[PDB]
């Protein structure tokens, strides 16, 4: 399994720990704060709850499943 880096500056890719595997993203805008969308702090996690965060830590039980860019032409 892989999971995107902490996002220090260059959004790259890194392995997850022996416990953690799923990719998380922490955001306090969830919309469009202009310039750089939302804060979005990447990182690997082990749990994935869900109950209307309003601003909390989301995730996906997979590899690099937090790709914040995902910008591809067609």
């Amino acid at each position: 399994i892989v999971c995107h880096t902490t996002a220090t500056s260059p959004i790259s890719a890194v392995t997850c720990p022996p416990g953690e595997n799923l990719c998380y993203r922490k955001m306090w805008c969830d919309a469009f704060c202009s310039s750089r969308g939302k804060v979005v702090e990447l990182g690997c996690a082990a749990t994935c709850p869900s109950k209307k965060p309003y601003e909390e830590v989301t995730c996906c039980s997979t590899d690099k499943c937090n790709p914040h860019p995902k910008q591809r032409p067609g």
């Binding site: 902490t6 996002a7 220090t8 500056s9 959004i11 704060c33 310039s35 750089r36 969308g37 939302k38 804060v39 979005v40 702090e41 990447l42 914040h68 860019p69």
Partner: peptide, 19 residues
């Protein structure tokens, strides 16, 4: 004397987040 916060990350490249 720039105090400077504990600036976090943004989408990719918002510089030091605060300002």
């Amino acid at each position: 004397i720039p105090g400077k916060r504990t600036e976090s990350f943004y989408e990719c490249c918002k510089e030091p987040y605060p300002d």
